[PDB]
PDB file of C-alpha atoms and ligand atoms in Angstrom:
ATOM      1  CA  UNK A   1      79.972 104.503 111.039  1.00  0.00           C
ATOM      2  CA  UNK A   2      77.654 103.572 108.929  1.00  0.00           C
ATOM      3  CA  UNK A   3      74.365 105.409 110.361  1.00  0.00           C
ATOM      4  CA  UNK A   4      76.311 108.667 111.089  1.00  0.00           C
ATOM      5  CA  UNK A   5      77.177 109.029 107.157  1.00  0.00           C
ATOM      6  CA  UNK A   6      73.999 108.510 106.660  1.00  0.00           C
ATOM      7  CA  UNK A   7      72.610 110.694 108.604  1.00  0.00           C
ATOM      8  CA  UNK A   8      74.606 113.238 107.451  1.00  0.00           C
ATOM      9  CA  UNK A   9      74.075 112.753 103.797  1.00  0.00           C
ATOM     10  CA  UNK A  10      70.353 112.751 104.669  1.00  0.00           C
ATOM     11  CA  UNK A  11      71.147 116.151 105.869  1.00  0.00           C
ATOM     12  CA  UNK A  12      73.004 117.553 103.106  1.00  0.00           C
ATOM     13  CA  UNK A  13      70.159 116.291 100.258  1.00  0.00           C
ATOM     14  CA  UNK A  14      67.573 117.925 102.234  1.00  0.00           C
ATOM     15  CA  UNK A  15      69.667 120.979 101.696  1.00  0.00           C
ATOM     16  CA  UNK A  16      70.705 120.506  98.116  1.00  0.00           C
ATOM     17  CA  UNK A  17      66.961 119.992  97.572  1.00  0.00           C
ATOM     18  CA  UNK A  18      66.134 123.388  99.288  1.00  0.00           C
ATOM     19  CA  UNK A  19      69.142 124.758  97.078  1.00  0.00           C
ATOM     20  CA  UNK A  20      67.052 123.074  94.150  1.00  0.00           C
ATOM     21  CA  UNK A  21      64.192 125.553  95.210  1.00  0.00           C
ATOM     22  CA  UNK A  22      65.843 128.421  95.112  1.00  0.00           C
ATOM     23  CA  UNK A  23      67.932 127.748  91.716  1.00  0.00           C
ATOM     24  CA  UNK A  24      65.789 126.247  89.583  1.00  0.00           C
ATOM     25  CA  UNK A  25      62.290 127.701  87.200  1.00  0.00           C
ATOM     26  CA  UNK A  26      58.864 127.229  88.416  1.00  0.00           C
ATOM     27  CA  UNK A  27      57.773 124.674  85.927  1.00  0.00           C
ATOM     28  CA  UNK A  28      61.031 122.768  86.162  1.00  0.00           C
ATOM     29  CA  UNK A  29      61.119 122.666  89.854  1.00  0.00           C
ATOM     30  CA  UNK A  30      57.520 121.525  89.605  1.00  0.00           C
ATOM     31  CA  UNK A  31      58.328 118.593  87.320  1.00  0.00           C
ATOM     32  CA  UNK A  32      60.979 117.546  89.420  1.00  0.00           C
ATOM     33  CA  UNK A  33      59.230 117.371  92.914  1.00  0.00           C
ATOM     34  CA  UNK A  34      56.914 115.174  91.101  1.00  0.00           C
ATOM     35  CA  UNK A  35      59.296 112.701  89.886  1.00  0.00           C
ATOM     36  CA  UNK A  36      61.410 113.175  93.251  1.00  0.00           C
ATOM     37  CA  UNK A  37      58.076 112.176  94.797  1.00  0.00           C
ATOM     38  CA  UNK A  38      57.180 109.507  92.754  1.00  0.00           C
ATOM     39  CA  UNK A  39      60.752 107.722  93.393  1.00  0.00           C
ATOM     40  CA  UNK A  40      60.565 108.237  96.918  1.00  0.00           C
ATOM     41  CA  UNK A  41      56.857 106.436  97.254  1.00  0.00           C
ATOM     42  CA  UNK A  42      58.123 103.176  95.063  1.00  0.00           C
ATOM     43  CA  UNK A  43      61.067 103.071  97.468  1.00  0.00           C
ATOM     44  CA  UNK A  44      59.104 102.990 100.101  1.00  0.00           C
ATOM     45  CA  UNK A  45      56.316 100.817  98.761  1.00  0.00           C
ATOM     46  CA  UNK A  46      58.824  98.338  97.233  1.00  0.00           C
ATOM     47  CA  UNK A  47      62.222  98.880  98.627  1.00  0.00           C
ATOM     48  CA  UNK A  48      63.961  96.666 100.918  1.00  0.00           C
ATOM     49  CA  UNK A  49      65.626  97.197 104.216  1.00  0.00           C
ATOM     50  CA  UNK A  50      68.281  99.957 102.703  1.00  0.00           C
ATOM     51  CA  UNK A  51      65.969 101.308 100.297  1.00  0.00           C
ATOM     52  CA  UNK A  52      66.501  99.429  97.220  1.00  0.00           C
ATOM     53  CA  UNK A  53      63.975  97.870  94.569  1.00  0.00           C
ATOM     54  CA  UNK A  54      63.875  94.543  92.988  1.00  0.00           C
ATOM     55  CA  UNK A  55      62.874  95.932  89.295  1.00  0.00           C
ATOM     56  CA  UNK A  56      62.669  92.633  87.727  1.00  0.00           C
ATOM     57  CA  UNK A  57      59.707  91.527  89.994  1.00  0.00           C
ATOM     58  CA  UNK A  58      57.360  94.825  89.541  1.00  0.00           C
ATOM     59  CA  UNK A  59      54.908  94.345  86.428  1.00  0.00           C
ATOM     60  CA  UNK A  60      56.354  96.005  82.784  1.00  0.00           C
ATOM     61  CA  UNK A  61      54.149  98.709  83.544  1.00  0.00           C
ATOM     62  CA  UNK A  62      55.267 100.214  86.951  1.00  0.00           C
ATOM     63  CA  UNK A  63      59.146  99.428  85.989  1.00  0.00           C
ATOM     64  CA  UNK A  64      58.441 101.814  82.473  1.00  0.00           C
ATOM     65  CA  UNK A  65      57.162 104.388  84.888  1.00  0.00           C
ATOM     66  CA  UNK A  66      60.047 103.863  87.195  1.00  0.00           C
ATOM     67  CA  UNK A  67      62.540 104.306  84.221  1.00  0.00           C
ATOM     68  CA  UNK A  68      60.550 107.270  83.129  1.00  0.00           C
ATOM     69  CA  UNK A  69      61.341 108.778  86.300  1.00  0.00           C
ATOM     70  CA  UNK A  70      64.730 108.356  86.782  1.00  0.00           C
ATOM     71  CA  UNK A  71      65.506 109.313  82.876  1.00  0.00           C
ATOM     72  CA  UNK A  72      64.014 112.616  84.149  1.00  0.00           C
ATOM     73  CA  UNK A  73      65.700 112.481  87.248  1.00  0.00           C
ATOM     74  CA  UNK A  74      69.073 111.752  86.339  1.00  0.00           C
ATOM     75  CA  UNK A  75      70.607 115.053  84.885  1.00  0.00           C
ATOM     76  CA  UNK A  76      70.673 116.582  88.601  1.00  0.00           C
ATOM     77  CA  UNK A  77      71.892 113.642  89.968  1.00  0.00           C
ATOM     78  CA  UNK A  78      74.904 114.031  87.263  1.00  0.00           C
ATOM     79  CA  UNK A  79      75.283 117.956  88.260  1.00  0.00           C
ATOM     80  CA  UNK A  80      75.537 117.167  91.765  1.00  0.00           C
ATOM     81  CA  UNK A  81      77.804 114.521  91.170  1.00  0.00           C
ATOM     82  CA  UNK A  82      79.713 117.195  89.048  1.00  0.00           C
ATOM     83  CA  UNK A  83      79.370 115.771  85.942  1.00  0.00           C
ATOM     84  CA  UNK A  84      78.020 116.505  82.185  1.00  0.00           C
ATOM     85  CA  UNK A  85      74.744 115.152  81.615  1.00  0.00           C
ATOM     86  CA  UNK A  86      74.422 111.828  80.624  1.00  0.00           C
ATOM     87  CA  UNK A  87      71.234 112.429  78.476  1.00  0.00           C
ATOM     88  CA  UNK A  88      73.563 114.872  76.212  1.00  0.00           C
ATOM     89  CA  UNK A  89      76.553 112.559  75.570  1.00  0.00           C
ATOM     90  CA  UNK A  90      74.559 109.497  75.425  1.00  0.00           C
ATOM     91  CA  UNK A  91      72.548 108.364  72.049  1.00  0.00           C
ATOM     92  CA  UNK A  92      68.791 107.620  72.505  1.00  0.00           C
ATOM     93  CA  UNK A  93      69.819 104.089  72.602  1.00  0.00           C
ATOM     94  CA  UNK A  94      72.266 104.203  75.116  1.00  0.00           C
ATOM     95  CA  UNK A  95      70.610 106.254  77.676  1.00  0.00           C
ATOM     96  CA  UNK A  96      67.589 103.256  77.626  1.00  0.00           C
ATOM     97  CA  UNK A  97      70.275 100.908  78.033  1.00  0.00           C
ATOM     98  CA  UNK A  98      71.981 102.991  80.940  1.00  0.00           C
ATOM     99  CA  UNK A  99      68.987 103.138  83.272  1.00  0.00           C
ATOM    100  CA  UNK A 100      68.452  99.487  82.445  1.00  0.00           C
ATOM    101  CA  UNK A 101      72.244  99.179  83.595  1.00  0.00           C
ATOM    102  CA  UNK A 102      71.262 101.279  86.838  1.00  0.00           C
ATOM    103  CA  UNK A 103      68.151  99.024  87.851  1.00  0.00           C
ATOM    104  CA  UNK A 104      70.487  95.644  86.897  1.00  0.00           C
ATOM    105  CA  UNK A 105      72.610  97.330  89.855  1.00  0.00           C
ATOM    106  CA  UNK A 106      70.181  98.200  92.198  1.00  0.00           C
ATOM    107  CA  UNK A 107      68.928  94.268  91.976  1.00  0.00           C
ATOM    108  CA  UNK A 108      71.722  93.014  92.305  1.00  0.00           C
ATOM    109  CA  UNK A 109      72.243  95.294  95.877  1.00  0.00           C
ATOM    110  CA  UNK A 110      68.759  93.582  96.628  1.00  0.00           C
ATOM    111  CA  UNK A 111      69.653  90.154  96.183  1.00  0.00           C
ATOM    112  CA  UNK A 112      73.127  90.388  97.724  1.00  0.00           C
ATOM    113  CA  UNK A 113      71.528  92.815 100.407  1.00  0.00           C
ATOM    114  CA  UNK A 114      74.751  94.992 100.251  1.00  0.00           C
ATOM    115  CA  UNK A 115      74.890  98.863 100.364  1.00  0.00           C
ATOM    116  CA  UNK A 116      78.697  99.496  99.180  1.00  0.00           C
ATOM    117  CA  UNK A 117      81.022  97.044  97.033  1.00  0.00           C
ATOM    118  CA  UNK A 118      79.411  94.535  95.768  1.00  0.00           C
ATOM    119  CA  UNK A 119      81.731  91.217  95.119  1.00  0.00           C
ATOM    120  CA  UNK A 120      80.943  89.498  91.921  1.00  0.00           C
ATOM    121  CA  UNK A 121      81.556  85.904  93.608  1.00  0.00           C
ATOM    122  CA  UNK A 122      78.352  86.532  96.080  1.00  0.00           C
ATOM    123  CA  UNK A 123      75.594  87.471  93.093  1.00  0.00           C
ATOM    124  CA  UNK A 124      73.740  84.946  92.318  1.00  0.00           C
ATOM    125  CA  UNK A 125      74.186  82.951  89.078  1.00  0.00           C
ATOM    126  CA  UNK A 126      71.151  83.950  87.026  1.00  0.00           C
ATOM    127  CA  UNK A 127      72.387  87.210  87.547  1.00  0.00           C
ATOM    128  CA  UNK A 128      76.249  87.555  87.150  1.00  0.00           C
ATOM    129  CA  UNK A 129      77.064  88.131  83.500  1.00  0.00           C
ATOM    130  CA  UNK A 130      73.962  90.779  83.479  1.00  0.00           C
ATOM    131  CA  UNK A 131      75.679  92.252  86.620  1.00  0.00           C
ATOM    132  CA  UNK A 132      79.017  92.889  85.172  1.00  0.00           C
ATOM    133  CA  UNK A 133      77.277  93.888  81.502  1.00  0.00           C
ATOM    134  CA  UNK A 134      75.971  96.854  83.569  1.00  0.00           C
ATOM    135  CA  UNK A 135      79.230  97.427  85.763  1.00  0.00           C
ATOM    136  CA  UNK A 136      81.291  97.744  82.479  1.00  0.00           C
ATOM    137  CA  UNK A 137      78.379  99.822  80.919  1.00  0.00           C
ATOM    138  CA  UNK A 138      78.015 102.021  84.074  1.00  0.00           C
ATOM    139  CA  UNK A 139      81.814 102.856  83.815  1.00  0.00           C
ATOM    140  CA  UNK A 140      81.640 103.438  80.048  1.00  0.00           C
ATOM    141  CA  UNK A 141      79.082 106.059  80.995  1.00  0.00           C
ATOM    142  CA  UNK A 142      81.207 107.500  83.865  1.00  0.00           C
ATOM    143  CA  UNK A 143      83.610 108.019  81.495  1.00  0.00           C
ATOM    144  CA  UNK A 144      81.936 110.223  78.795  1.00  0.00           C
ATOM    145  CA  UNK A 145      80.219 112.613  81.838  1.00  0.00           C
ATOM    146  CA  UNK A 146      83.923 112.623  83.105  1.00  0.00           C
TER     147      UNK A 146
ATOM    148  CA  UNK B  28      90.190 102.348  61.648  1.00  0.00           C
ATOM    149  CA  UNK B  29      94.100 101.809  60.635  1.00  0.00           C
ATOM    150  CA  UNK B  30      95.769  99.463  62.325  1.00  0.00           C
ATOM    151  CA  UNK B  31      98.837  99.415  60.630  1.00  0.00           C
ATOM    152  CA  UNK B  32      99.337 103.052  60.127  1.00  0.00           C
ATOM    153  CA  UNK B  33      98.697 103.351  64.281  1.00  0.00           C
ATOM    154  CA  UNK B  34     100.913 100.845  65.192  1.00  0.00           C
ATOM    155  CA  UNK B  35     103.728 102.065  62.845  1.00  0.00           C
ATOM    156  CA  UNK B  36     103.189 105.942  64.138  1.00  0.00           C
ATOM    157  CA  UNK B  37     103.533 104.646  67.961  1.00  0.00           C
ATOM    158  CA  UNK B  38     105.953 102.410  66.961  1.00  0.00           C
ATOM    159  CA  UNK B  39     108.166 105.028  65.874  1.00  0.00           C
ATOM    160  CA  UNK B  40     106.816 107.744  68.161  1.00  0.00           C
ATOM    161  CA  UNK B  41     108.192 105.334  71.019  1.00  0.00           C
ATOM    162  CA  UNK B  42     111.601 104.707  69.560  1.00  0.00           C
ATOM    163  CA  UNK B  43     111.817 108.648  70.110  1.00  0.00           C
ATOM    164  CA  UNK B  44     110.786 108.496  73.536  1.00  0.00           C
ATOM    165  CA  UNK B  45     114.347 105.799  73.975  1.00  0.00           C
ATOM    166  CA  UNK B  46     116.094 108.409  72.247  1.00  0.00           C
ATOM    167  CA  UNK B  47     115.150 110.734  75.110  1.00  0.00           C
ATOM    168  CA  UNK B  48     115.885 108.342  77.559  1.00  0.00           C
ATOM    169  CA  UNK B  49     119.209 107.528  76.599  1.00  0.00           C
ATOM    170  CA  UNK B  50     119.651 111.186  77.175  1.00  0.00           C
ATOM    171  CA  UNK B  51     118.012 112.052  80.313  1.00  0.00           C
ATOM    172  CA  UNK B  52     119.009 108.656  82.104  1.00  0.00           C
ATOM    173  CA  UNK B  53     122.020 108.802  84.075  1.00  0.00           C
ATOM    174  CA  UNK B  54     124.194 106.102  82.832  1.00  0.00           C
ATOM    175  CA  UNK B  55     123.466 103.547  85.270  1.00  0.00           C
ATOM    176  CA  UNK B  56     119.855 103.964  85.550  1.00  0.00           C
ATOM    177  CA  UNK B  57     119.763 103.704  81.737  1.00  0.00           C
ATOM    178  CA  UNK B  58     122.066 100.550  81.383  1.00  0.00           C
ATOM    179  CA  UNK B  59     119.739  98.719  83.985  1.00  0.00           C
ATOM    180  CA  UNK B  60     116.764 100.246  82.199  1.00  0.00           C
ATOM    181  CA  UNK B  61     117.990  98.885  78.589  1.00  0.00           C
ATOM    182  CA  UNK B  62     118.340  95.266  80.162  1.00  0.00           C
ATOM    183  CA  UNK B  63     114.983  94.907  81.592  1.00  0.00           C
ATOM    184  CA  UNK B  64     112.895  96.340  78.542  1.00  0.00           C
ATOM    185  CA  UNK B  65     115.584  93.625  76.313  1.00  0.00           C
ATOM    186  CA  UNK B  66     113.976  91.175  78.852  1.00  0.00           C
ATOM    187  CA  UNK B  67     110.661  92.148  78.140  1.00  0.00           C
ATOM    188  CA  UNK B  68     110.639  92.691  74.654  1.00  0.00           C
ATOM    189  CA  UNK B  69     112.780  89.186  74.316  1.00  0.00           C
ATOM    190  CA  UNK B  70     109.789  87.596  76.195  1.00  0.00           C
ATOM    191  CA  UNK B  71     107.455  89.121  73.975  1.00  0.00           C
ATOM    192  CA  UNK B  72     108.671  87.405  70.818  1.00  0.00           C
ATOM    193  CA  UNK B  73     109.047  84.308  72.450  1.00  0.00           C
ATOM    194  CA  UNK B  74     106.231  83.752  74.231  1.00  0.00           C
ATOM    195  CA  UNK B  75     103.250  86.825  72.784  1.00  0.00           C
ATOM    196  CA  UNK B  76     100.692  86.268  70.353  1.00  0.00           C
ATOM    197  CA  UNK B  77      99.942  87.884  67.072  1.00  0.00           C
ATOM    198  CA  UNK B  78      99.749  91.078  69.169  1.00  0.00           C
ATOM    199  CA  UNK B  79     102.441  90.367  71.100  1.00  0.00           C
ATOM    200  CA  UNK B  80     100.733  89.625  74.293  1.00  0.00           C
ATOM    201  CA  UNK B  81     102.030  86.819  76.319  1.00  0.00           C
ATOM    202  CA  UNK B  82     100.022  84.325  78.101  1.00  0.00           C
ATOM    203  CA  UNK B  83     101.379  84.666  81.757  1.00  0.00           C
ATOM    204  CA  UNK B  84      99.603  81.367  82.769  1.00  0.00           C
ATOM    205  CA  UNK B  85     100.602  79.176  80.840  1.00  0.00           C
ATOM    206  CA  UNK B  86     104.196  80.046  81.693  1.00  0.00           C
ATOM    207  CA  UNK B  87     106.127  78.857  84.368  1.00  0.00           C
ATOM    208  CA  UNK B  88     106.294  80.129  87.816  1.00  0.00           C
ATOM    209  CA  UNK B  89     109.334  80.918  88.016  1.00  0.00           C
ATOM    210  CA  UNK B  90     109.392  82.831  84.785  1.00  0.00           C
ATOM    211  CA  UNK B  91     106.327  84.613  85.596  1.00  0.00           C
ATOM    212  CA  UNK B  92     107.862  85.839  88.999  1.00  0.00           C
ATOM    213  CA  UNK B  93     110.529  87.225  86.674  1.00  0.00           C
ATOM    214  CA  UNK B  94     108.446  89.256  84.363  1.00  0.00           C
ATOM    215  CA  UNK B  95     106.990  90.499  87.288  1.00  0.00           C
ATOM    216  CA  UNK B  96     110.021  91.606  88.304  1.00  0.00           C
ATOM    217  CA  UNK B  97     111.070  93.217  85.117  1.00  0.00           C
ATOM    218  CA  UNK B  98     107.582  94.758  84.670  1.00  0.00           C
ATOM    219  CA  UNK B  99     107.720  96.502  88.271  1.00  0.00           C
ATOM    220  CA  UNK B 100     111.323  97.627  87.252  1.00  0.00           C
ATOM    221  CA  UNK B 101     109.569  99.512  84.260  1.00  0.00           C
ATOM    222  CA  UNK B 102     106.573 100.241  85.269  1.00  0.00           C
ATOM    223  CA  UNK B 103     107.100 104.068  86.790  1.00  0.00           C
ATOM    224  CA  UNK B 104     108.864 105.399  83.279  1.00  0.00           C
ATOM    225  CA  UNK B 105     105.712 104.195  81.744  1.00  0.00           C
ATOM    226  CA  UNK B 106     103.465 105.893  84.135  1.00  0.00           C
ATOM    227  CA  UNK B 107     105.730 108.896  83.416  1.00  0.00           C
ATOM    228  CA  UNK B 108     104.869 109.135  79.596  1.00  0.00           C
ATOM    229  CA  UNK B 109     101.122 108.332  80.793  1.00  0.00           C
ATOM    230  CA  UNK B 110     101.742 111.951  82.531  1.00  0.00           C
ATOM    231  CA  UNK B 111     101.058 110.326  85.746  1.00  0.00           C
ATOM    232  CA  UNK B 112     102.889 110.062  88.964  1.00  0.00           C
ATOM    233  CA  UNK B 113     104.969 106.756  90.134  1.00  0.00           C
ATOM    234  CA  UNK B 114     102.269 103.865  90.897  1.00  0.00           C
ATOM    235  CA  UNK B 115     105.024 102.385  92.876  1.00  0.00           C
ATOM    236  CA  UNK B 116     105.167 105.495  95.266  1.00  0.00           C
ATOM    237  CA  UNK B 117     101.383 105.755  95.804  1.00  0.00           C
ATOM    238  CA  UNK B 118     100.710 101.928  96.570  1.00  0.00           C
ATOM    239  CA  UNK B 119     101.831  99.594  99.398  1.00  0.00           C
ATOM    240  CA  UNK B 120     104.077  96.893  98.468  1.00  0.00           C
ATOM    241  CA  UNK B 121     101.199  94.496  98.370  1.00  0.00           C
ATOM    242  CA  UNK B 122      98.944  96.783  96.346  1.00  0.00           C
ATOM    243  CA  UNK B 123     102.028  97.081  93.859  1.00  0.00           C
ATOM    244  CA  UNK B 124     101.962  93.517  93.735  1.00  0.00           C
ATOM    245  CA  UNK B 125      98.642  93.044  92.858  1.00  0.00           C
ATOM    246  CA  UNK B 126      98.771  95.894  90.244  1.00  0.00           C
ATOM    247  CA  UNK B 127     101.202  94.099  88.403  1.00  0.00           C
ATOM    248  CA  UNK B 128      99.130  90.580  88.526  1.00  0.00           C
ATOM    249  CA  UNK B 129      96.006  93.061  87.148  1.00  0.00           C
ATOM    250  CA  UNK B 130      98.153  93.878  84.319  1.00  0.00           C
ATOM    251  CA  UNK B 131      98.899  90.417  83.954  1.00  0.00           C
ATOM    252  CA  UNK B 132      95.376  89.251  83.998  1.00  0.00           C
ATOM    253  CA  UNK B 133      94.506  91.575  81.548  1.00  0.00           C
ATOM    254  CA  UNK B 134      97.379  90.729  79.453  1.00  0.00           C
ATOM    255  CA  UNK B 135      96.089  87.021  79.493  1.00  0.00           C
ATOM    256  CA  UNK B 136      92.415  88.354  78.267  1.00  0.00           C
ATOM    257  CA  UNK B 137      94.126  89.768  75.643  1.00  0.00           C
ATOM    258  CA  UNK B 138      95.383  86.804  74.264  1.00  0.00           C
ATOM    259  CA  UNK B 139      92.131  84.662  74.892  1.00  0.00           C
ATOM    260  CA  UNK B 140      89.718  87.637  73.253  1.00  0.00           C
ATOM    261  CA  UNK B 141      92.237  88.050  70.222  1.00  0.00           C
ATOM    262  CA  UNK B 142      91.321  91.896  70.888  1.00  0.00           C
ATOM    263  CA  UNK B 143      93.652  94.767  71.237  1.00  0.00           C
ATOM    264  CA  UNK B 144      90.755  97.370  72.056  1.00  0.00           C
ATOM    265  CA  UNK B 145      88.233  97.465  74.563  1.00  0.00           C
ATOM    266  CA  UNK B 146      87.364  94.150  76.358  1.00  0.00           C
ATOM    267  CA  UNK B 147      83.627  93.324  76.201  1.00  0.00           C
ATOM    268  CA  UNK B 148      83.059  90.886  78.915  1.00  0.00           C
ATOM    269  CA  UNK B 149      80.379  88.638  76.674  1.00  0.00           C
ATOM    270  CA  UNK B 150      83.817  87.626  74.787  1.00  0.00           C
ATOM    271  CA  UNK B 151      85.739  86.944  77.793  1.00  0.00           C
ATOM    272  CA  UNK B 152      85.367  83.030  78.474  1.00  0.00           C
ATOM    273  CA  UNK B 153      84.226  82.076  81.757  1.00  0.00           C
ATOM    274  CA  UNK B 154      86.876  80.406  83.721  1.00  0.00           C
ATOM    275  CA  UNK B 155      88.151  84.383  82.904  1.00  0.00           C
ATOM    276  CA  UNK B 156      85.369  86.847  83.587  1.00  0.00           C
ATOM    277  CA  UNK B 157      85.356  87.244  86.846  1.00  0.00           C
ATOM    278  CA  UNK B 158      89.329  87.749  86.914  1.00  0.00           C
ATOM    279  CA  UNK B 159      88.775  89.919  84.863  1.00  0.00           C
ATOM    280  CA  UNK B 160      86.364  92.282  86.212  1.00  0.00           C
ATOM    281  CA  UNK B 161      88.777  92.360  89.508  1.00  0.00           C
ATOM    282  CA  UNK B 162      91.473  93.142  87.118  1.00  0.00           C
ATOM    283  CA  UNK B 163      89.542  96.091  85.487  1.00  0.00           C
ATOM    284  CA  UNK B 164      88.562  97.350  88.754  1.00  0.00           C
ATOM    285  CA  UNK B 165      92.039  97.617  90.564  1.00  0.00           C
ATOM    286  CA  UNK B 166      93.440  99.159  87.376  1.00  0.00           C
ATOM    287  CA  UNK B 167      90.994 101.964  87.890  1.00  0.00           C
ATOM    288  CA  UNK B 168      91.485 102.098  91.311  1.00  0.00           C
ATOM    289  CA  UNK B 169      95.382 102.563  91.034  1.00  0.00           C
ATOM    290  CA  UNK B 170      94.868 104.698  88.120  1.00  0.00           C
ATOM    291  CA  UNK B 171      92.513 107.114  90.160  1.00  0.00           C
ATOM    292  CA  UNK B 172      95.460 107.332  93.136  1.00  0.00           C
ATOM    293  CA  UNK B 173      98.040 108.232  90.139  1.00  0.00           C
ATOM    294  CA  UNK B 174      95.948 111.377  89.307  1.00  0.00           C
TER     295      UNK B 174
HETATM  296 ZN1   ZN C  15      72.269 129.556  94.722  1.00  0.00          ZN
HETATM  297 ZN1   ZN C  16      65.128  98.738  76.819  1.00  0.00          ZN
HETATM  298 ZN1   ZN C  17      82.254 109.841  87.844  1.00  0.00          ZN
HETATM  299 ZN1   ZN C  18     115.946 116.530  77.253  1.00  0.00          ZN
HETATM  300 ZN1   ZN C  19     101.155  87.738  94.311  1.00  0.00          ZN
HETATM  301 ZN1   ZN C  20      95.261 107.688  83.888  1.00  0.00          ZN
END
């Protein structure tokens, strides 16, 4: 049941977000309802039906504020997923080329229209060795945050 | 990085982990044991690379459905010095089945790559990539459900 789960989940980030409140500084929790915001507005002005963006066809200025975002983003979304930052294990380098590896993803859910598994034989051809570059990136990751 | 200092370490770090199983086998489950890993190491020399992988493709079918016998015969003593439980007792038959063709696709990579490390799918040719990424992903599927 797909709309129940997501329902639900809906549910339980609008509390982790008023747990976010509560937990974290004033400045910090200022920052981050800003970026939170700023994601939320680009899905909406450029996501498709589920939600997702097609990075590769914004200009190289929105998609550098995008990726600004979720590099600031992305240390609570490793806490709540119960893992070590990804910023702190990660080189300069390889954080870039992480949320690069994130937005290859979230394409490729775009242009196979598909919310779970994704099955390498339906994404397209311009985009299959750059899709399973960021798979085996994305695990590499995974790994190092546990 | 030393390659041959590794491989002779593990090399003899394994050939005390027979020791042990000659002693905690009982003596049938150890004489089977001792013929299938003669099988496999047999197969490796005959068939393996310069790292001693084999190229299960090119083989026959019949031989292949062999190794795959052997290698399912074997395969819970090695998830036992992995510290892990039996792969065998937390899969279906079919999902056992297809573990053991992962392994075998990987295997295969091996021997195309020339690597004994991490596989960097650039490297991996393309009649192979996509095999291979399937492969990848059921080995850390089963390997999740063993922990
Ligand atoms: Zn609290
Ligand atoms: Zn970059
Ligand atoms: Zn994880
Ligand atoms: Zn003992
Ligand atoms: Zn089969
Ligand atoms: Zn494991």
């Amino acid at each position: 049941h797909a709309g129940t789960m997501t329902l639900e989940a809906y549910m339980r980030f609008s509390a982790k977000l008023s747990e976010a409140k509560d937990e974290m500084g004033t400045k910090e929790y200022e920052v981050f309802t800003k970026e939170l915001k700023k994601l939320t507005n680009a899905k909406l002005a450029y996501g498709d039906a589920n939600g997702n963006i097609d990075y590769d066809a914004l200009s190289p200025e929105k998609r550098e504020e995008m990726k600004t975002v979720s590099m600031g983003l992305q240390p609570y979304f490793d806490k709540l997923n119960g893992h070590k930052s990804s910023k702190e294990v990660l080189t300069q380098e390889e954080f870039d080329r992480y949320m690069e590896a994130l937005m290859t993803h979230e394409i490729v859910r775009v242009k196979t229209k598909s919310t779970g598994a994704i099955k390498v034989e339906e994404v397209p051809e311009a985009y299959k060795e750059r899709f399973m570059k960021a798979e085996q990136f994305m695990e590499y990751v995974d790994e190092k945050v546990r």
